[PDB]
Amino acid sequence: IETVPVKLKPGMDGPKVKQWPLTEEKIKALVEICTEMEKEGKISKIGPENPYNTPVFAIKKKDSTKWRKLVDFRELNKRTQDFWGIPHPAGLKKKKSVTVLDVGDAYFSVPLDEDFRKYTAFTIPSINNETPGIRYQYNVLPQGWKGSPAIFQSSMTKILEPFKKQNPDIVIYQYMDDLYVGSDLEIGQHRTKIEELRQHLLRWYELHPDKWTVQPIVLPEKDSWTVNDIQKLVGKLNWASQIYPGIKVRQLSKLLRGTKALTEVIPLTEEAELELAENREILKEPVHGVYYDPSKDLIAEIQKQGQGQWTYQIYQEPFKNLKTGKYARMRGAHTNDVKQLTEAVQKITTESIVIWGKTPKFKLPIQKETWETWWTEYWQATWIPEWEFVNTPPLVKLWYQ
Amino acid sequence: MVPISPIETVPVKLKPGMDGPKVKQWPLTEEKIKALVEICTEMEKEGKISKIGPENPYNTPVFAIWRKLVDFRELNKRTQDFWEVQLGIPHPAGLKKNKSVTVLDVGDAYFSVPLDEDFRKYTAFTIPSINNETPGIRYQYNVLPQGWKGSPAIFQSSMTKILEPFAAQNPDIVICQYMDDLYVGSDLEIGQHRTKIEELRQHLLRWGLTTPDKKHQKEPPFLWMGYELHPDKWTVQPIVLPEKDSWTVNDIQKLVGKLNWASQIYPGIKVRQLSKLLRGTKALTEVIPLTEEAELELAENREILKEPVHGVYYDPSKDLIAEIQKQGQGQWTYQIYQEPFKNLKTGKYARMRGAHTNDVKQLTEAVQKITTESIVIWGKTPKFKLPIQKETWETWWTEYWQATWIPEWEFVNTPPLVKLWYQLEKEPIVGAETFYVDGAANRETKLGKAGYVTNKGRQKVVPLTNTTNQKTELQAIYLALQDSGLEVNIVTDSQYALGIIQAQPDKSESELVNQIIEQLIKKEKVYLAWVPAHKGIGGNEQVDKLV
Numbered sequence: 013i014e015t016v017p018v019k020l021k022p023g024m025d026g027p028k029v030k031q032w033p034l035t036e037e038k039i040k041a042l043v044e045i046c047t048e049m050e051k052e053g054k055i056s057k058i059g060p061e062n063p064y065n066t067p068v069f070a071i072k073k074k075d076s077t078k079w080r081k082l083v084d085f086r087e088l089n090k091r092t093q094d095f096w097g098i099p100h101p102a103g104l105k106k107k108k109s110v111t112v113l114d115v116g117d118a119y120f121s122v123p124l125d126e127d128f129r130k131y132t133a134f135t136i137p138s139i140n141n142e143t144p145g146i147r148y149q150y151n152v153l154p155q156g157w158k159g160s161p162a163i164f165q166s167s168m169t170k171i172l173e174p175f176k177k178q179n180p181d182i183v184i185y186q187y188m189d190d191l192y193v194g195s196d197l198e199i200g201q202h203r204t205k206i207e208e209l210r211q212h213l214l215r216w217y218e219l220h221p222d223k224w225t226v227q228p229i230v231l232p233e234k235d236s237w238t239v240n241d242i243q244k245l246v247g248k249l250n251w252a253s254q255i256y257p258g259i260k261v262r263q264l265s266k267l268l269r270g271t272k273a274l275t276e277v278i279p280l281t282e283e284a285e286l287e288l289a290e291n292r293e294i295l296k297e298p299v300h301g302v303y304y305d306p307s308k309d310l311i312a313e314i315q316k317q318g319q320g321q322w323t324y325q326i327y328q329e330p331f332k333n334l335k336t337g338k339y340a341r342m343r344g345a346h347t348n349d350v351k352q353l354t355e356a357v358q359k360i361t362t363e364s365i366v367i368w369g370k371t372p373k374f375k376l377p378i379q380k381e382t383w384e385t386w387w388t389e390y391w392q393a394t395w396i397p398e399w400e401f402v403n404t405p406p407l408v409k410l411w412y413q
Numbered sequence: 414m415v416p417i418s419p420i421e422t423v424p425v426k427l428k429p430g431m432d433g434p435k436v437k438q439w440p441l442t443e444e445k446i447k448a449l450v451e452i453c454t455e456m457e458k459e460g461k462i463s464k465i466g467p468e469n470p471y472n473t474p475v476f477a478i479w480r481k482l483v484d485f486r487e488l489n490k491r492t493q494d495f496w497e498v499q500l501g502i503p504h505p506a507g508l509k510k511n512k513s514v515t516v517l518d519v520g521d522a523y524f525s526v527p528l529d530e531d532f533r534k535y536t537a538f539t540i541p542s543i544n545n546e547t548p549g550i551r552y553q554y555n556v557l558p559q560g561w562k563g564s565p566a567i568f569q570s571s572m573t574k575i576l577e578p579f580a581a582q583n584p585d586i587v588i589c590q591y592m593d594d595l596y597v598g599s600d601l602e603i604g605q606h607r608t609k610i611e612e613l614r615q616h617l618l619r620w621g622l623t624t625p626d627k628k629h630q631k632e633p634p635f636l637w638m639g640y641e642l643h644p645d646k647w648t649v650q651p652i653v654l655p656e657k658d659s660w661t662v663n664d665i666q667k668l669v670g671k672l673n674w675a676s677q678i679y680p681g682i683k684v685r686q687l688s689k690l691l692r693g694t695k696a697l698t699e700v701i702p703l704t705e706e707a708e709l710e711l712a713e714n715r716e717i718l719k720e721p722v723h724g725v726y727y728d729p730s731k732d733l734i735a736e737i738q739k740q741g742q743g744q745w746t747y748q749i750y751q752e753p754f755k756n757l758k759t760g761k762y763a764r765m766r767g768a769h770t771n772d773v774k775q776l777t778e779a780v781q782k783i784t785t786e787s788i789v790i791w792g793k794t795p796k797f798k799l800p801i802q803k804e805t806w807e808t809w810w811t812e813y814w815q816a817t818w819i820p821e822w823e824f825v826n827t828p829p830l831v832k833l834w835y836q837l838e839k840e841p842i843v844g845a846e847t848f849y850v851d852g853a854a855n856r857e858t859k860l861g862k863a864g865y866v867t868n869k870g871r872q873k874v875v876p877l878t879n880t881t882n883q884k885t886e887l888q889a890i891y892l893a894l895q896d897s898g899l900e901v902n903i904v905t906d907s908q909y910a911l912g913i914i915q916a917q918p919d920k921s922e923s924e925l926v927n928q929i930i931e932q933l934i935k936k937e938k939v940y941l942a943w944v945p946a947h948k949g950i951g952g953n954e955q956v957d958k959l960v
C-alpha cells in the first residue's frame with residue numbers, strides 16, 4: 013500500500029533488449045492477457061519517451077491450457093541494485109519431500125515505485141514490423157523481477173507467520189515467484205497439507221530430494237577383458253586421476269604391451285587385479301577439498317547420452333563437482349532433442365535453487381541458432397538461467413555413461 | 414468555430430547531465446535574411462513558432478536553401494533517446510490482398526502536433542539582422558520541428574493514439590501509418606470503402622487535421638523501398654546487371670547488392686564466387702580481375718534475371734510451405750509459397766565461416782533461418798520440403814553428440830540429396846586388422862614422422878617436413894586408412910583428431926582432413942578408439958615416430 017524506493021546500480025542505465033519474434037497465437041494471447049491486466053491497473057500504456065525494453069513471450073504451464081505471460085527480466089535483474097540477506101536453508105535439500113507453489117499473483121497487490129516503473133517497459137510485437145509494437149510498463153511488482161520477492165518479503169513473513177508457528181517441522185523457502193515447502197510427511201498428508209497452505213494463502217509439483225544423491229565413478233566388473241575393454245578402462249582411470257590423486261594405471265597399462273587385436277581377450281595379472289581393486293577403493297571415497305563458495309558462479313554441464321538419457325555435473329572449480337546426476341525422464345519429448353534439453357535445464361535449475369538458492373550457468377551441447385530458435389517453445393518455469401554453447405564434442409562424455 | 418480536440422503532448426527531457434544547445438548563428442546574405450523573415454513571419458502567423466526574449470540562452474543555427482532549414486544536430490546529440498519508430502522494414506510478402514487500398518496525406522498534421530512546453534526553449538533560433546545593426550529575431554518552436562530527433566516517434570505515437578478508436582470500431586478495414594501517409598485497405602465494396610475513407614477524414618478533422626481532397630499522387634504500382642506493390646502481386650524494382658569490360662571493387666559490390674536484393678523473389682541467385690573476389694580488399698577503387706567461376710555464376714544470374722518474376726501476397730487461410738535445395742560450395746536456396754508455382758518469396762543461405770562442416774548442419778541452420786524469417790513476416794512456422802531422407806535425418810540426430818531439431822517437414826526427391834557419407838562403428842570390429850597410429854614433430858626444425866604398427870606385423874613410418882604435431886597425428890590416421898582393408902580398427906592418442914572426426918565433417922579447409930574423409934567414404938567399417946598417450950600402452954609407439 014506504500015511504495016519503497018528502488019533504483020539501479022550506480023552508472024548503469026535501464027535495460028534496452030530487443031524483443032524477439034513471436035508467433036501469431038502468442039501475440040494474441042499476450043494481447044488478451046495485457047488487456048485484462050490493463051483493466052486491473054497492473055500495467056499501463058506508455059509513450060515514445062520510454063526507450064527501455066525487456067523481452068516478453070507466452071508459455072503454457074503444466075496441466076493447464078491457459079496461456080501465461082513470461083517476462084525475461086535477466087538484464088533488468090542484473091542491472092537492479094542488490095537487495096538485502098537471509099541465509100539459505102541448508103535443511104531444505106535434506107528434507108524428504110518439497111512442493112513448489114506459484115505465489116506470483118500476490119506480487120500484483122503491492123504497487124511499484126513510480127520513478128522505477130519506466131525500467132519495466134516491454135513490447136508486444138507486431139507481425140511483419142507493421143507497428144513499433146504495443147508498449148506497456150508495470151505499475152505493481154512484476155513477476156520475474158528480483159526486487160519483487162525482496163519487497164514482498166515482510167508481507168510474506170506476516171502471511172506465513174501462523175503456519176510457520178503451527179508446524180515448526182516444515183521448511184519454507186522463497187525464490188522469485190516460487191515457494192518451496194519441504195517436510196517428511198506421507199504423500200497424502202503432504203498433499204492435504206499443501207491444500208491447507210494454499211487455502212491459508214488464498215484468504216490473505218512433487219519433488220523428493222531424499223531420493224537424490226551424488227553419483228560415484230564406477231568401473232566395470234568383468235570375468236574376461238578384451239584389449240578394447242582394458243584401453244577404455246585405462247582411459248577412464250586416467251581421467252579420474254585428475255579428480256582422485258592416488259589413481260594408478262601402470263599395472264593395467266602393462267597388459268596392453270604389444271600390438272594386439274582390439275577384440276582379443278587378455279587375462280588380468282594379479283598386480284593388475286590389485287591395482288584395479290585399489291582404484292575401486294579410492295573411488296568409493298568422496299573428493300578431497302570440495303566446498304561451496306557463495307561468491308562464485310555455479311557451472312552446470314550437460315551431456316546427451318542418447319535414448320533419452322542425459323548426464324549433468326554442477327561444479328565451481330574444475331574436477332570439484334558439487335553435484336552430479338542423470339536425467340532420463342521421458343515426458344512427451346521422445347522425438348525432440350531440444351524439448352528434452354529444455355526440460356533437463358529446468359530440472360537442474362530447480363535442483364540448484366533447492367540446494368544453493370541460486371541458478372547455475374549452463375554449458376549446452378547445442379548450436380546457438382537451434383537453441384535460441386526453439387527453447388521458448390518448451391519453457392515452463394518462471395525464472396530463466398544463463399547459458400553458453402559448446403561446439404566441440406567433449407571426450408569425457410562416455411566417462412559419465 | 415467547432416472546438417478542436419487537443420493533442421496530448423509527450424514529455425521530453427535532455428540526456429542526463431547535459432544542457433541545451435548553444436551554437437553561433439552563421440552570417441547570412443541580405444536576400445537570405447529577407448527570405449527567412451518572410452517565412453518565419455508566415456509560420457508565426459500560423460502558430461508553428463513564437464518570438465522569445467533575450468532571457469533564452471540557447472540557440473540553433475538556421476539556413477535557407479527560399480526554404481528554411483534548421484540544423485538540429487547539436488540538440489539531437491543532446492536529446493534523450495526515444496523508442497524506435499520501427500523495429501524493422503515490413504516485407505511485401507506479408508501483406509494481405511485488399512480489394513481497395515487508399516492513400517491519405519496527413520502531412521499537414523505533422524505541424525499540428527504540439528511540442529512539450531518545457532522543452533520548447535531548447536529549439537530557439539536567431540534570424541540575423543540586416544548588416545547586423547539590430548538584434549536578430551529570436552524564435553522558438555511550438556510544434557515538432559522537422560529534423561529534430563524526437564519528431565517522427567512522437568508524431569507516429571500521436572497519430573496512433575488518434576487512430577486507435579476508429580480502427581477498433583471498424584475491424585473490417587486495415588489502417589497503416591507510414592511517414593506522413595496513411596494507407597487504408599478493405600475488401601468492402603468501393604462505395605462503402607470510399608465512405609469509410611470519408612469517415613476517417615472526418616474523425617481526423619475532429620482533431621483539426623486536414624487531409625487533402627485533391628486526387629493523390631500515389632497510385633498503383635506503388636514504388637517503395639526498392640519494391641513494386643501491385644493490386645494482386647509484388648516484385649522488386651527492375652534489376653539490371655550492367656555489361657562491364659572490366660569490373661572494379663564498386664562494380665562488384667553494386668553487383669552483389671543487386672543480386673542479394675533480387676534473391677528475395679528470383680530463385681537460384683548465387684553470390685559466392687563474386688563475393689570471393691572482395692576478400693580482404695578494403696580498397697573501393699581497386700580493380701580486381703574476374704575468375705572463371707565468377708563468370709559462370711554471373712552468366713547463370715543473367716539467365717535467371719532475364720525476365721520479370723513476381724511474388725504473391727499472403728493468404729492466412731492456406732498453409733505455408735518452404736522448400737530448400739542445395740546449390741554446392743556451401744550455398745543453399747529456398748522458396749516460400751502457399752500454392753505450387755506461385756511463390757510468396759525466395760531466398761538463399763550461405764554456410765558460416767568454419768574449419769569443418771557437413772551438409773546436414775548447413776541444412777539445419779538454413780531451416781532455423783527460414784523459421785525465424787517466416788515467424789517475422791507471417792507469424793508462423795512453415796511446413797518444410799527438404800532434400801533429405803527421413804532415415805538419414807533419424808540416423809543423424811539419434812547419433813549426433815549435440816541436441817538438434819528440425820520442425821515438421823517432409824522429404825522431397827530433388828538432387829543433390831543430403832546424405833551421411835560415413836558412420837563410425839560403436840564397437841571394435843572382430844576380424845579386422847588393428848592399426849596403432851602415432852605422429853610427432855619437432856617444434857624448431859618442423860621435422861616430423863607419422864606411422865602405424867598393426868597386430869599382423871604391418872608397419873610404416875614416413876618422415877615429413879614443414880609439419881606440426883597435429884598434422885602428423887592426422888597424417889598417421891590417413892596412412893592407416895590408406896593401407897588397410899575395407900574394415901579396420903584404428904587406435905590413436907590424438908585428442909585433436911578425435912575432436913575433429915567426432916564432429917562428423919564431410920568437407921574441410923585442411924586437405925589432409927578432406928583426404929581422411931575420402932578414405933572414410935571408401936571404407937565399409939571403421940572403429941576409432943582413443944587412448945591416453947605416454948601411459949605405456951603397448952602398440953601405441955611414441956618412440957617410433959620421435960626418432
Ligand SMILES: *CCC(=O)N(C)c1cc(Oc2ccccc2OCCn2ccc(=O)[nH]c2=O)c(C)c2cc(C#N)ccc12
Pocket residue numbers: 142503508509510511512513514587588589590591596597598631633635636637642643644645726
Ligand atoms: C503503413 C504502410 C506500410 O508500412 N507499408 C509497408 C506499405 C503497405 C502498403 O500496402 C497496404 C497498405 C494498407 C493495407 C493493405 C496493403 O497492402 C495489401 C496488399 N496490396 C498492396 C498494394 C495494392 O495495390 N493492393 C493490395 O491489396 C502500401 C501500398 C505501401 C505503399 C507505400 C508507398 N508509396 C509505402 C508503404 C506501403
